[PDB]
Specification:
2 copies of one chain form a homodimer.
Chain A (H helix, E strand, L loop, with lengths): L3 H11 L12 H40 L7 H5 L3 E11 L7 E6 L4 E6 L7 H4 L3 E5 L5 E3 L2 E3 L2 E2 L1 E2 L6 E2 L18
Antiparallel strand pairs in A: 1-2, 1-4, 2-3, 4-7, 5-6, 8-9
Protein name (chain A): Methionine--tRNA ligase
GO molecular function (chain A): ATP binding; methionine-tRNA ligase activity; tRNA binding
Catalytic activity (chain A): tRNA(Met) + L-methionine + ATP = L-methionyl-tRNA(Met) + AMP + diphosphate
């Protein structure tokens, strides 16, 4: 464990140098600077809150104006692999309220994807579903679980919708904007 | 004599206890150790919030930059420090005196889509009834500034010759939220 002096030291490591390279920090002065630093940081938190509200409004504005800019080349789009995939199984992930562990069929192969859909989707809703994923991703550990790929979604608000093919097609089918 | 020679450790720790958030569980035991540890954790949390806020701010600055260089007309060059100032027509919805000051007025302003609260130094020269209903020019993009516990969002413009103080209005009717520009060709 750590004693009172230990934590007062740690508080000493957290606070601002306060310039004036010649002063010595005792317990009481470290605690003084700590109380004051917490108050300062709280004022800052207020300002930051307001700033964040305006930030969300700006995100809205940006999506909408983004509707008005088309600069995307077909090559850059081809840099993404979007695939239809089937849900063989879906599981809740211990310690996480936001996570579902998904087992997906690409046809020939299986993929494991840890997704942020747990609030909006039950494993029973998902199992058997054909959904759209971003297929080309180096595997990465999420919450202790290796995950290959991200699943597409429309966030729309505080809800979520996955993305599905309108008609039934075989898993592994690539999505394309090309005419053929 | 008789007196021992400003606050001790436990007073400071009580204070830190005042500053930190509650556990929300009644069985919880707050001793000096838990208060100090919670203080360390709270400080780190606040620091992370601060850095995140800084990143948000930086990116908003960049969006502002991109927008300003988009708005750019071929006639305006070399004026950038002026273009950075966002001058707006705002309509005064309400004004009231500020308790404790005879200099200050609190103004509620309409920018069109949004409203702003701004503290102005004009109370000596202008009455509330004089200002209400009128369209004035403000600097809208100034960082929010706390004055008398009021957050002033932007500041109004005023001109003084040393004798008289005037606010700044458009010569003709313009819609509130109108952005001011240099008239050039």
């Amino acid at each position: 464990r750590f004693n009172i002096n230990d934590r007062i030291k740690e508080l000493g490591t957290l606070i601002p140098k306060s310039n004036d390279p010649d002063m010595r920090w005792n317990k009481g002065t470290i605690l003084k600077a700590s109380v004051d630093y917490i108050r300062k940081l709280q004022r800052e938190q207020q300002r930051a809150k307001e700033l964040e509200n305006r930030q969300k409004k700006l995100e809205h504005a940006c999506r909408h104006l983004l509707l008005r800019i088309q600069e995307l080349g077909i090559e850059d789009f081809l840099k993404v692999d979007l695939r239809v995939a089937k849900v063989l199984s879906a599981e809740r992930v211990e310690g996480s309220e936001k996570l579902l562990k998904l087992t997906l069929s690409l046809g020939d192969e299986e993929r494991t994807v840890v997704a942020g859909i747990a609030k909006y989707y039950t494993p029973e809703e998902l199992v058997g579903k054909k959904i759209v994923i971003v297929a080309n991703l180096k595997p990465r550990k999420i919450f202790g679980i290796e995950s290959q790929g991200m699943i597409l979604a429309a966030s729309d608000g505080e809800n979520l919708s996955v993305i599905v093919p309108d008609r039934d097609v075989k898993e592994g089918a690539k999505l394309s904007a090309a005419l053929e």
